[PDB]
Amino acid sequence: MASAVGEKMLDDFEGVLNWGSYSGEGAKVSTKIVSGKTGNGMEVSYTGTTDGYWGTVYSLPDGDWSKWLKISFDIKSVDGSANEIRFMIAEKSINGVGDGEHWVYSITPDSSWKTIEIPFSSFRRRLDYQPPGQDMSGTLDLDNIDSIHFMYANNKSGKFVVDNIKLIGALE
Ligand SMILES: [Ca+2]
Ligand SMILES: [Ca+2]
């Protein structure tokens, strides 16, 4: 730890890749490390179909960040396209099986680097799909997070880079 601003880095891609990519049923993925907005970055590549799927997954060491934190990441498009993607956040189960609640938000990139900061206040529940070992609170609980997922939100192809994935929070 360093005795400064409440900013907490999560990932910055300066070491070996540590994310869980997947696709299927006529949809496809490809993924590797690159040069990023700072030092190294990660680049992903996707191919869609109307009923197929693609995504990639991060496993947190620490999963409470309530009272005042926001998230921030840097992103840029390497197809030039403004492809529609979504985040999904899984909450902890009160039973200790699977997940407790599923929360979503859709976003779009640009052809130059963008610093996407989100206050967590923009997310909603996944409406047709939720887990059985649930909390069902209608509150996204930054006391008790389980995992985070990047996912398809469209059926076309696309390619992009990401870096600088952190929590932010100060008086400024
Ligand atoms: Ca970096
Ligand atoms: Ca909840």
The token pair that represents 114 in the structure block: 């963008």
**Separation of CA 62 and ligand 2 centre (Å):** 17
CB atoms within 10 A of CB 89: 21
Ligand 1 centroid, distance to 166 Cα (angstroms): 11
Cα of 25 vs centre of ligand 2, distance in Å, is 32
The DSSP code for 93 is P
Judged by its nearest atom, the ligand closest to the C-alpha of residue 140 is 2
Residues 6+ apart with CB under 8 A from 119: 70
- CB of 80 closer than 8 Å to CB of 47: no
Determine whether 49 is exposed, middle or buried from the number of CB atoms within 10 Å of its CB (0-12, 13-18, 19+).
middle
Cα-to-centroid distance, 75 and ligand 1 (Å) = 11
Q: Which ligand is located closest to the Cα atom of residue 144? A: 2
Domain interval for residue 110: 1-171
CA distance 147 to 8: 17
Determine the residue type at 109.
Answer: P
Q: In the chain, what's the furthest Cα-to-Cα distance?
A: 50
| Other residues' Cβ atoms within 10 Å of the Cβ of residue 96 | 8
CA atoms of 83 and 113, how far apart (whole Å): 15
**Residue 31 to residue 56: CA distance in whole angstroms:** 9
Domain with 126 in it: what CATH number? 2.60.120.430
Number of domains the chain contains: 1
